Design a binder for this molecule. Structure first.
Ligand SMILES: CCCCCCCCCCCCCCCCCC(=O)OC[C@H](COP(=O)([O-])OCC(O)COP(=O)([O-])OC[C@@H](COC(=O)CCCCCCCCCCCCCCCCC)OC(=O)CCCCCCCCCCCCCCCCC)OC(=O)CCCCCCCCCCCCCCCCC
Ligand SMILES: CCCCCCCCCCCCCCCCCC(=O)OC[C@H](COP(=O)([O-])OCC(O)COP(=O)([O-])OC[C@@H](COC(=O)CCCCCCCCCCCCCCCCC)OC(=O)CCCCCCCCCCCCCCCCC)OC(=O)CCCCCCCCCCCCCCCCC
Ligand SMILES: CCCCCCCCCCCCCCCCC[C@@H](O)O[C@H](CO[C@H](O)CCCCCCCCCCCCCCC)COP(=O)(O)OCC[N+](C)(C)C
Ligand SMILES: CCCCCCCCCCCCCCCCC[C@@H](O)O[C@H](CO[C@H](O)CCCCCCCCCCCCCCC)COP(=O)(O)OCC[N+](C)(C)C
Ligand SMILES: CCCCCCCC/C=C\CCCCCCCC(=O)O[C@H](COC(=O)CCCCCCC/C=C/CCCCCCCC)COP(=O)(O)OCCN
Ligand SMILES: CCCCCCCCCCCC(=O)SCCNC(=O)CCNC(=O)[C@H](O)C(C)(C)COP(=O)(O)O
Lengths: 175, 70, 53, 56, 459, 178, 88
């Protein structure tokens, strides 16, 4: 279905076997699915086509809202309230987008586990490893902020993380 | 056998009357709402996503999908 | 009022976040960028204080 | 009968009058916070040919 | 915000100019209309807030509380219509005036951009409730109950005024937005410790925190039905809302300051749940159940995590609705029996089946049966506490089991068994009481369909 | 149940009660009918040996070791009739018992149904209203001074009189109303 | 359930049947009103066994305080009818 992007939600080609009846006995599954088709799928398709033509009779559009980029908290003055407000709003929007990215990766992982069946432990290493990276990044950015989170606290956490990394690199190089 | 006896029990009139009244009013307003929602869904709604044409700025209610939300 | 609350427009911006995340993941997977980045702000713009201990 | 039921039903109009007055007062108080209209760095927009204010 | 405030103010002249036999109808109709207007506030944004003006703002933490406050008044009027039948018109109008003034104070309290205005209204709510308790109260202990309720609150909240004026003298502002944006850490100092205590104790005493909960059983048992409804539904949530608003400036002092209160709440939920098992009064049992729920809400607020805050908001709303319904059921029994004792009237399911159904649904909702929002808040807070420490699960499970135990005990003692023989004045339940229970219970099951409306700003 | 209790139980009543309990528990132990008949006859033979004993002290010493022997071998799961205070259906139908005064609160649309029943009920009400006023004075004059010594009530002695305190004994709902 | 509505005649017939199956008491001598101690010369233990036989026959059990003062078949039938709410 064109309603979603196939690249964002990848799927295997879904190769399926062909019916190879070994006996002369007529299986009931085919007869039941044929009668199901006749008694269910046809009226549903007709109703859907009627509703779709009624929708095509009246067509109108809606648009995705685009947001400009604004200066972030790292380039705001100590007591400047306007730039702090703008940076806080931008950071909150970025936080929501990051959460939804993690949601997309988790959906991919769940779909892989269900689809691969009994061989999921081997055939879903790629999704698991992507989720490992995304979870590590997300955890670094937002963990332990608390209920009253803000861009300033995230910046302080990043600052202390970079100080620790710089100290470790200096100690390792000067070892 | 004509052994029909009397069953002593509390009055079920007021409970049944309250239930009927509550159902009557709830349906009185819910049936028109359901009919209107169905008519709107079949005839009008479910807009489709588009790209903003250059030089055009949309109004605030044009960023939503369902007609009732708009 | 229940019907009104059911059909409230998205001022919390959920599907907007979905579309933003979808386009960002499309861009990053295609360009080889590793999805989300560990640092929320670019380190070039932070001036750390030199310790000299 | 008009001019008789009014003397007993005049009270009903009061809550509704209060609501419209409160809406008017909300808009009037809103009118005093326009110092940054079309000046936010996020929604800084050029006016339409027949537009004086981005929002009211 | 004035589109809600002005009609509530106009409720007073409408009530005082109403006919002697048309006060209840007009008050109920216009209160319901005001509630409909309040529904518009629920639409909320993921961004900062709904900043209407310099004086008032709305948020997804304040919006559900405002909606509940506006919705509660018609129910309180319906409950009060019965026992005030033999009252003079002037005194009934005074009662309605007290209820309207309390609603107005609560509405202005929940918006309150500035903290001193919040304190002023948070204290202004104290007078109408006191008058309602000590004037239209049945027993002779209502005076002592009102004294307890007044003095506990005032002793708790007097240091809060000093703390607030000191904070404004130092920082320069008490507007919540500036306070949030210009927040600074608190150094571990004795002066900062006492400032933390002065900021916290006023809201702790009204939760009520275990050991400071003595006023609540007295006030709830001695109050009339409308007073009990409002006290259990809205007045208890003022402390939680204040703590959620004020814990932004108490960091990082809260990490170690919270332990005495966390231990008190975690043990006190068990204590009060066990107290509920041995109780001879319905109202006292419901009050102690409220104490347990609010102690668990205190734990949630003290943990100070996003899941904690969402669970606390959901549990506050659900507890308000459930406690109001339980108090209304107890009052329906009391107005028939005039005793307020569990063991006197027994086996009421045989005589009143629909009211027994209402009892069962209320007990199931208090028991936190999924997927009710009661369990949503309960489970979110339990998960947050488990992340805080894996050993909390024992206390949480004990509390859950005891809660189910006394809820079903209260249901079985009053509804099941054999009817009392000598009680023969148990008339069929009126349409008013049934409608009251229905209007209490249906919003809960409708809200469980849209839980995001009551999960607060951190959703 | 119906009979008023006495201030105490005599020796003979206690002996009968032990005999009944022992027979019931022996029947519970001995499922089969012929075995139960044999052991019940043997129990009766062992039981009536001390029938003719005369002095009170040895009689009181007996029945006591008998009760201890009964308690040692009392079959911790005896047979119980379903309607007994320990049976599987002791209070099964108590939820279907509705008092008679509940009919006084029926809606007139409900009382339109069953008109003869309500006419008879009104006649019963009139009878009770007169009989109670007679019964109060009858019980006042018949009771010993200083209060009753036992919870036994006297019957009616006049022609039109009814037994005192009869309304709530005659108008029991039923054993199985539904 | 499907339980037939037993009547006074059935109760009396069953009581007299069980009594006539009691070899200690002669069938001819006994009468609905025939007393136990004096008219038939039975012991009190015989009375309690008669009560137990009634209990096993009718499937319900009589309390001891009521049983110890049931001395004639007629009043036994009356007690059973009062307990089971028999009309006729
Ligand atoms: C206590 C009670 C208190 C009540 C308080 C008041 C209520 C408060 C809440 C109100 C909220 C209303 C709301 O939000 O609506 C939700 C929502 C609204 O829809 P929407 O999301 O706005 O529209 C979606 C799209 O944008 C648009 O979709 P679309 O355009 O493709 O859909 C077409 C359109 C119309 O669709 C069609 O016409 C066709 C669809 C079926 C076609 C099937 C084939 C038929 C043709 C074949 C046979 C005939 C032709 C062939 C004949 C020949 C055959 C041989 O859809 C509808 O009209 C749906 C109508 C739903 C009405 C809801 C009204 C709510 C009223 C609220 C108050 C109610 C009070 C109670 C009284 C209510 C009245 C009873 O409606 C539903 O969710 C429907 C649910 C369907 C469930 C399907 C089954 C699921 C089962 C899963 C679990 C199973 C295991 C367990
Ligand atoms: C399970 C699906 C059901 C679908 C059918 C739709 C049912 C609509 C019900 C609407 C809400 C009920 C309102 C409460 C007051 C009841 C009014 C009343 O007096 O009835 C008189 C009326 C007339 O009888 P009457 O002879 O005149 O009165 C004589 C006495 O009243 C004697 O009356 P009684 O002896 O018959 O007892 C009254 C009855 C009615 O009273 C009640 O207790 C019913 C309320 C139970 C909920 C208690 C709170 C626990 C948290 C649940 C919150 C979820 C709500 C979902 C949204 C609800 C929307 C409003 O109580 C019960 O039968 C026992 C209830 C225990 C059920 C425990 C299971 C609950 C959890 C199940 C999961 C639900 C979601 C599934 C999710 C996964 C699958 C998708 O009887 C009824 O109509 C009974 C109501 C229908 C039974 C409801 C049982 C389940 C439905 C729960 C809500 C709908 C779930 C949505 C999923 C659909 C798929
Ligand atoms: C009695 C015997 C049975 C008779 C009835 C039979 C029929 C059964 C139906 C009853 C329940 C069955 C479950 C069916 C659920 C379908 C409806 C559901 O889908 O709507 C919900 C919507 O419900 C509402 O959101 C919740 C109700 C609002 C609650 C507010 C309370 C009303 C105010 C009263 C005062 C408030 C007091 C409490 C203060 C907070 C969730 O919809 P959602 O997926 O999300 O999006 C809506 C569609 N969009 C996408 C276009 C937006
Ligand atoms: C009655 C029902 C319940 C009501 C509510 C009860 C809740 C109130 C309890 C208050 C919470 C604790 C208060 C202070 C906690 C700070 C931690 C401190 O007490 O521990 C040690 C403090 O050591 C000793 O405790 C010193 C204080 C001793 C005097 C206090 C009295 C002890 C019992 C009093 C309890 C009375 C409560 C009720 C009052 C009416 C730490 O040693 P130190 O590193 O040096 O100090 C660190 C703080 N600095 C950095 C600012 C210096
Ligand atoms: C249900 C009853 C509960 C009653 C409340 C209990 C707690 C009360 C809180 C303590 C009272 C004083 C509050 C402090 C007011 C805020 C001002 C502030 O924080 O500034 C501090 C002021 O701190 C103080 O002065 C505190 C002094 C305490 C005197 C009053 C004692 C009252 C009782 C204290 C013990 C009990 C507290 C906990 C009670 C537990 C619950 C019963 C620093 O002052 P500066 O000198 O300007 O700065 C220092 C650098 N130069
Ligand atoms: C399976 C359970 C275990 C079994 C263990 C039980 C052991 C029980 C054995 C004890 C035997 C005894 O009787 S203990 C002996 C106690 N003393 C007497 O019996 C003195 C006078 N007896 C009476 O008065 C009786 O009532 C009587 C005359 C029988 C009837 O009288 P009626 O004319 O008023 O029917």
């Amino acid at each position: 279905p064109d309603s979603w992007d196939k690249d964002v939600y990848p799927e295997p080609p879904r190769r399926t076997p062909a019916p190879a009846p070994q006996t002369s006995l007529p299986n009931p599954v085919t007869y039941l699915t044929k009668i199901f088709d006749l008694l269910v799928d046809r009226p549903v398709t007709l109703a859907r086509e009627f509703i779709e033509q009624q929708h095509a009779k009246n067509r109108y559009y809606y648009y995705h809202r685009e947001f400009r980029r604004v200066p972030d908290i790292t380039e705001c003055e100590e007591k400047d309230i306007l730039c702090m407000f703008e940076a806080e709003m931008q950071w909150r929007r970025d936080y929501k987008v990051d959460q939804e990215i993690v949601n997309i990766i988790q959906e991919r992982l769940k779909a892989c586990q269900q689809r691969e069946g009994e061989s999921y432990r081997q055939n879903c290493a790629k999704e698991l490893e992507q989720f490992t990276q995304v979870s590590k990044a997300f955890q670094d950015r937002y963990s332990d902020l608390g209920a009253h989170y803000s861009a300033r606290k995230c910046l302080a956490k990043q600052k202390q993380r970079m100080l620790a990394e710089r100290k470790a690199a200096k100690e390792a190089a000067a070892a | 056998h004509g052994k029909r006896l009397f069953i002593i029990k509390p009055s079920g009139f007021y409970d049944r009357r309250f239930l009927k009244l509550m159902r009557f009013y709830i349906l009185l307003t819910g049936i028109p709402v359901a009919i209107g929602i169905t008519l709107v869904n079949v005839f009008i709604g479910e807009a489709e996503l588009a790209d903003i044409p250059e030089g055009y700025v949309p109004e605030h209610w044009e960023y939503f999908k369902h007609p009732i939300s708009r | 009022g229940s019907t009104f609350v059911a059909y409230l427009p998205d001022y919390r911006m959920q599907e907007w976040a979905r579309r933003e995340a979808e386009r960002l993941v499309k861009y990053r997977e295609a360009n080889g960028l590793p999805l989300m980045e560990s640092n929320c702000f670019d380190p070039n713009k932070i001036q750390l204080p030199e310790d000299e201990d | 009968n008009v001019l008789q039921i009014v003397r007993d039903h005049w009270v009903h109009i009061l809550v509704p009058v209060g609501f419209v007055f409160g809406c008017y007062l909300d808009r009037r108080s809103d009118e005093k916070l326009t110092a940054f209209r079309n000046k936010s760095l996020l929604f800084k927009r050029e006016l339409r040919p027949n537009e004086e204010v981005t929002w009211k | 915000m004035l589109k809600i405030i002005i009609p509530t103010t106009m409720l007073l002249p409408m009530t005082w100019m109403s006919k002697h036999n048309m006060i209840w109808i007009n008050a109920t109709v216009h209160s319901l209309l005001i509630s409909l207007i309040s529904l518009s506030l629920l639409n909320q944004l993921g961004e900062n807030s709904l900043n209407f003006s310099l004086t008032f703002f709305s948020d997804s933490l304040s919006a559900p509380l405002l909606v509940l406050t506006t919705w509660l008044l018609p129910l309180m009027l319906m409950a009060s219509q019965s026992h005030l039948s033999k009252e003079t018109t002037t005194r009934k109008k005074l009662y309605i005036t007290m209820l309207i003034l309390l609603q107005l104070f609560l509405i202005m309290t929940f918006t309150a951009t500035e903290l001193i205005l919040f304190y002023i209204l948070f204290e202004a709510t104290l007078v109408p409730t006191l008058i309602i308790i000590t004037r239209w109260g049945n027993q002779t202990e209502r005076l002592n109950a009102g004294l307890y309720f007044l003095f506990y609150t005032l002793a708790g909240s007097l240091p809060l005024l000093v703390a607030l004026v000191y904070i404004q003298n130092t920082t320069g502002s008490l507007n919540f937005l500036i306070i949030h944006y210009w927040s600074h850490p608190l150094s571990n100092s004795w002066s900062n410790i006492f400032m933390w205590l002065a900021c916290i104790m006023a809201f702790m005493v009204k939760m009520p925190l275990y050991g400071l909960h003595l006023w609540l059983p007295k006030a709830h048992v001695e109050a009339p039905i409308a007073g009990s409804m409002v006290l259990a539904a809205v007045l208890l949530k003022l402390g939680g809302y204040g703590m959620m608003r004020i814990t932004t400036i108490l960091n990082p002092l809260t990490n170690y300051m919270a332990y005495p209160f966390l231990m008190l709440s975690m043990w006190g939920m068990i204590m009060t749940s066990s107290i509920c098992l041995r109780q001879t009064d319905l109202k006292s049992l419901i009050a102690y159940s409220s104490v347990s729920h609010m102690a668990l809400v205190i734990v949630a607020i003290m943990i100070q995590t996003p899941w904690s805050f969402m669970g606390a908001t959901a549990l506050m709303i659900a507890h308000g609705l459930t406690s109001s319904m339980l108090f209304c059921l107890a009052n329906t029994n009391y107005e028939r029996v005039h005793s307020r004792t569990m063991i006197l009237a027994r086996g009421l399911q045989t005589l009143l089946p629909l009211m027994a159904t209402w009892w069962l649904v209320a007990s199931l909702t208090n028991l936190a049966l999924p997927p009710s929002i009661n369990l949503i808040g309960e489970l979110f807070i339990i998960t947050a506490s488990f992340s805080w420490s894996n050993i909390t699960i024992i206390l949480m499970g004990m509390n859950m089991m005891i809660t189910a135990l006394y809820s079903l005990y209260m249901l079985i003692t009053t509804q099941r068994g054999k009817y009392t023989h000598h009680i023969n004045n148990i008339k069929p339940s009126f349409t008013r009481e049934n409608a009251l229970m229905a209007l209490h219970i249906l919003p809960l099951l409708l809200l469980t369909l849209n839980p995001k409306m009551i999960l607060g700003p951190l959703y | 149940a119906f009979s008023a209790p006495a201030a105490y139980l005599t020796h003979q009543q206690k002996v009968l009660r032990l005999y009944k309990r022992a027979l019931r528990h022996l029947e519970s132990w001995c499922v089969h009918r012929d075995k139960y008949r044999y052991f019940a006859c043997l129990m009766r033979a062992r039981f009536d040996e001390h029938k003719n004993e005369k002095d009170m002290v040895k009689a009181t010493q007996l029945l006591r070791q008998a009760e201890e022997e009964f308690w040692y071998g009392q079959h911790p799961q005896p047979y119980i009739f379903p309607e007994s205070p320990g049976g599987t259906s002791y209070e099964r139908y108590e939820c279907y018992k509705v008092p008679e005064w509940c009919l006084d609160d029926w809606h007139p649309s409900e009382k339109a149904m069953y008109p003869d029943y309500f006419a008879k009920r009104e006649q019963w009400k009139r009878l009770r209203r007169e009989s109670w006023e007679r019964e109060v004075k009858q019980l006042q004059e018949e009771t010993p001074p200083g209060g009753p010594r036992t919870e036994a009530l006297p019957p009616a002695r006049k022609e039109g009189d009814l037994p005192p305190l009869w309304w709530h004994i005659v108008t029991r709902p039923r054993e199985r109303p539904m | 359930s499907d339980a037939p509505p037993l009547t006074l005649e059935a109760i009396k017939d069953r009581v007299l049947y069980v009594l006539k199956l009691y070899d200690k008491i002669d069938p001819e001598k006994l009468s609905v009103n025939s007393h136990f101690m004096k008219d038939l010369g039975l012991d009190s233990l015989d009375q309690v066994e008669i009560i137990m036989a009634m209990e096993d026959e009718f499937g319900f059990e009589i309390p001891d305080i009521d049983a110890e003062k049931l001395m004639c078949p007629q009043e036994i039938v009356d007690y059973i009818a009062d307990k089971k709410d028999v009309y006729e």
